[PDB]
């Protein structure tokens, strides 16, 4: 909402004459009480010869691209200059605005006599943009006949000492979408007397002798008031006075004819939208009714709307007159030849208009005010104000007929219910002791009825404030008018917190631990790539494909939510690689979305009570599973090139080591077992178990997934379900034996298919407590041990808890361990050593 | 009632005077203010804190409740503490 300071000032001045304030101050008072000033535009300044001219002669210049006009312009004192202009929106006899040589326009433009298109041009004719008066539309500014004689000082006629405040009103404050509302706000801020510009002293009631038009209203439509008055015999060629075309222009509304302009004006003055129907184009009774399935209307702009059974309409016997509250229709639109006007002054249902306007994408000036509730008490006053003004400009007469449907049965008092609040409740909530009676005076200033009753106020808010419904609403009023800056800064006593939880600590430690080892965290997108699972070659019944789908993504091809974090990780890996950062290791810690059924939503639960424990569990069960995952990808080098040697390319072993890092950070023990699972390589893919629960996978990616996905050769990956890794809080108590140790190295031959950790476990099982440490050294294959066998050399460190281990004692433990590997994985002793 | 404050317990009326008498002191009253002359074998009883511990230990420390105090907004750890 834009409006200009002069008008805002005029309306405040009625009740506090001589009121006036710098724009800077006004901007600050508006912010201080709740209104966002997006922008302050003082009307761009002019200097020198910028005067009204009259076009006296137009010569269409031929031979060029555009149609060009060499115009004789009467500039005062019988002085006629020729001027070149490209526009076409003006005729001989029109008052235009000319910047003559020596003038300076907004933006630092000096005008000079310039030869152009074959003739001399002594300046130019201005657009309202070039003057910084209004928005740039096509062509120049033309003034209504009689606004000014030629020669008149442009700056004075245009009123360029004005300033246009551009405000972003909040939806609770619809009443401020008008000069009426803001005026009242300013009067409240500055403790000024306020004359309501919709009061009867300012709009005397017009007579009421009979109904102005037949009207049926289906009341379940939500209409709360519907008033009509006609004006007959208006000059259709009359145009609106300069003052009125101007304030529309400053407010953002282009003028068209008095019928339309007067409604737009009174809409801005009082906040009550209005509309003008060509009465002679109405066939029969006016009907308010819902639309039917498949019904259609063409609105003013001649565009066909597909209607919805919740859109309220105005119809007649012939067709549709208005999508109520949003936009009139063509069928009754005022046109060039309209002599007799019927003026609509209605109050629609806020939620109805909101629904309808969002569906049709018609955020009209009318719609946005009805969304935020219009003061129903002023419809006839706005209708009367708007009728007199029309007759006054375009010279018709205002019939004393009047229709005024106010519901069934009629509402005669539009005041909300009274709200009941303790006199000092504002003081509590602010933490400030306001001077006595503050709270009552401020609630009176906004227009409420305040009655006292000991320590308990009874407050009936006024009809234009439907947002004032509980004491919290009343508090914000008092607090914003006194200023929020007067509220002190008092730290509250907060209780002994428990600090972070175990899982919160575990995510931090997983992050430190991976980051130190060279991984760079990304923020994964939850929106999957298109067809990623077709790229991975996942079977159609692969659980990962069962995705919760978003219904309005910012990319129509990417509407599924991630059931796995590798897609987003792999996407970031691709980005780093395409920018030359080929040696990368990324990781992420975020939830996935795995749904358990088809999207079942639970219906509304009353908000006046808290939901039951059961209603919570049902709400929780309605949502998909959303476990925390950790995941990571690696590509290129893992150790970089240097003086130490050429570096080490990423290998699947590095993804297993990522598992062990997360497990060490989580203080749990994991086992890795071979597995086939896409998108991993089948011969290099491990499944991760904590105890006997699967927590995820790790390994090198499938070479065919790599290839279809444009991924780097050899990329490795890892994903673990954190929710599947249990809490652990060890209280270790390590037995630290000081007695000497015996070191022996044993080599075992086993079938190639046997995992190294199996042989290690068997050796540990057989050797018992004496074995302090076991570690795999060598892994050797060759013909002489058998084409399908392999030789594992383990390094064993034995140590007794109470004695110096003999070296027979050790070989006892060795022999015992060798026997265990024989019985469990069929090991054969190769040999041993020290 | 200084013993009552420090313990966070409202002891039954006259407790504080009876217990200081029991240890052998001379207790004389003066409105809300006790005058306590400890006995010669108690040179450790030299300020009210000393007298508090007497009352509190005889009634039992177990009767003192467990009330978390309002602790203020801490600033948490310092940069050097974080760096270590």
Swiss-Prot record, chain B:
Compartments in which it is found: Cytoplasm
Spans through the membrane: none
Binding site for Mg(2+): 44, 50, 53-54
Signal peptide limits: none
Domain B5: 1-66
Further remark: Was identified as a high-confidence drug target.
Sequence similarity: Belongs to the phenylalanyl-tRNA synthetase beta subunit family. Type 1 subfamily.
Quaternary structure and partners: Tetramer of two alpha and two beta subunits.
Protein name: Phenylalanine--tRNA ligase beta subunit
Species assigned in the record: Mycobacterium tuberculosis (strain ATCC 25618 / H37Rv)
Species lineage: Bacteria, Bacillati, Actinomycetota, Actinomycetes, Mycobacteriales
């Amino acid at each position: 909402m834009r409006l200009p300071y002069s008008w805002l000032r005029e309306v405040v001045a009625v009740g506090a004459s001589g009121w006036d304030v710098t724009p800077g101050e006004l901007e600050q008072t508006l912010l201080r009480i709740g209104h966002e000033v997006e922008e302050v535009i003082p009307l761009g300044p002019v200097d020198g010869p910028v005067t009204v001219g009259r076009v006296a002669d137009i010569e269409e210049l031929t031979g060029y691209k555009k149609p060009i006009r060499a115009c004789a312009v009467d500039i005062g004192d019988r002085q006629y200059r020729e001027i070149i202009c490209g526009a076409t929106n003006f005729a001989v006899g029109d008052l235009v605005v000319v910047a003559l040589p020596g003038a300076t326009l907004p933006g630092g433009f000096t005008i000079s006599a310039r030869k152009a298109y074959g003739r001399n041009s002594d300046g130019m004719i201005c657009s309202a943009a070039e003057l910084n008066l209004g928005a740039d539309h096509s062509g120049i500014l033309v003034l209504p006949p009689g606004a000014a004689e030629p020669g008149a000082d442009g700056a004075g006629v245009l009123g360029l000492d004005d300033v246009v405040f551009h405000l972003a009103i909040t939806p609770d404050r619809g009443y401020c979408m008008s000069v009426r509302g803001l005026a009242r706000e300013l009067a409240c801020a500055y403790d000024l007397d306020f004359v309501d510009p919709a009061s009867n002293s300012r709009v005397p009631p017009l007579p009421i002798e009979g109904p102005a038009w037949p009207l049926t209203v289906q009341p379940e439509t939500g209409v709360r008031r519907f008033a009509l008055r006609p004006v007959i015999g208006i000059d259709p060629a009359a145009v609106s006075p300069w003052w009125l075309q101007r304030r529309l222009l400053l407010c953002g509304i282009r003028a068209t004819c008095p019928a339309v302009d007067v409604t737009n004006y009174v809409m801005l003055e009082l906040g009550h939208p209005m509309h003008a129907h060509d009465r002679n184009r109405i066939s029969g009774t006016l009907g308010v009714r819902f639309a039917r399935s498949g019904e259609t209307a063409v609105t003013l702009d001649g565009i066909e709307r597909k209607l919805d059974t919740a859109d309220v309409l105005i119809v007649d016997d012939a067709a549709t007159a208005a999508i109520g509250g949003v936009m009139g229709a063509a069928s009754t639109e005022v046109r060039a030849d309209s002599t007799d006007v019927l003026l609509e002054a209605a109050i629609w249902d806020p939620a109805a208009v909101s629904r309808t306007q969002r569906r049709l994408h018609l955020p009209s000036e009318a719609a946005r005010r009805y969304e935020r509730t219009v003061d129903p008490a002023i419809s006839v006053a706005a209708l009367d104000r708007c009728a007199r003004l029309l007759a006054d400009i375009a010279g018709g007469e205002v019939s004393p007929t009047l229709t005024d449907w106010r519901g069934d049965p009629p509402c005669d008092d539009w005041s909300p219910p009274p709200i009941r609040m303790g006199v000092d409740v504002p003081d509590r909530i602010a933490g400030v002791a306001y001077p006595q009676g503050t709270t009552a005076r401020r609630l009176a200033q906004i227009g409420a009825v305040v009655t006292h009753d000991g320590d308990t106020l009874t407050v009936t808010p006024p009809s234009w404030r439907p947002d004032l419904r509980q004491p919290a609403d009343l508090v914000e009023e008092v607090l914003r008018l006194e200023g929020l800056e007067v509220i002190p800064s008092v730290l509250p006593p907060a209780p002994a917190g428990r600090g972070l939880t175990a899982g919160q600590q575990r995510r931090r430690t997983i992050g430190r631990s991976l980051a130190l080892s060279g991984y760079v965290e990304i923020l994964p997108t939850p929106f999957l790539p298109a067809g990623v699972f077709d790229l991975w070659g996942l079977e159609a019944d692969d659980s990962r494909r069962m995705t919760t789908r978003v219904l309005n993504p910012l990319e129509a091809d990417r509407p599924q939510l991630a059931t796995t974090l590798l897609p987003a990780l792999l996407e970031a890996l691709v980005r780093n690689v395409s920018r030359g950062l080929v040696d990368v290791a990324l990781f992420a810690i975020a939830q996935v979305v795995q749904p358990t059924e088809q999207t079942r939503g639970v219906g509304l639960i009353p908000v006046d009570r808290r939901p039951t424990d059961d209603e919570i569990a049902m709400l929780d069960a309605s949502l998909p599973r959303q476990p925390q995952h950790v995941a990571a990808v690696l590509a290129g080098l893992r150790e970089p090139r240097g003086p130490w040697g050429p570096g080490r390319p990423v290998e699947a072993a590095d993804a297993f080591e990522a598992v062990r890092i997360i497990a060490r950070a989580s203080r749990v023990d994991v086992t890795l077992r071979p597995a086939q699972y896409l998108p991993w390589h089948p011969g290099r893919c491990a499944q991760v178990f904590v105890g006997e629960s699967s927590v995820g996978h790790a390994g090198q990616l499938h070479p065919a997934v790599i290839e279809r996905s444009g991924l780097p050769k050899g990329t490795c990956a890892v994903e673990l379900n954190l929710d599947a890794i249990p809490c652990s809080a060890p209280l270790p108590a390590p037995r630290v034996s000081p007695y000497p140790a015996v070191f022996q190295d044993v080599s075992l031959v086993v079938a190639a298919d046997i995992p190294a950790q199996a042989v290690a476990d068997a050796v540990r099982a057989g050797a018992g407590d004496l074995l302090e440490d076991i570690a795999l050294f060598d892994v050797f294959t060759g013909p002489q041990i058998g084409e399908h066998r392999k030789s594992l050399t383990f390094a064993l460190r034995f140590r007794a808890p109470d004695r110096t281990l003999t070296e027979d004692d050790a070989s006892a433990a060795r022999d015992a361990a060798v026997q265990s590997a024989a019985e469990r994985v069929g090991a054969v002793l190769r040999g041993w050593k020290l």
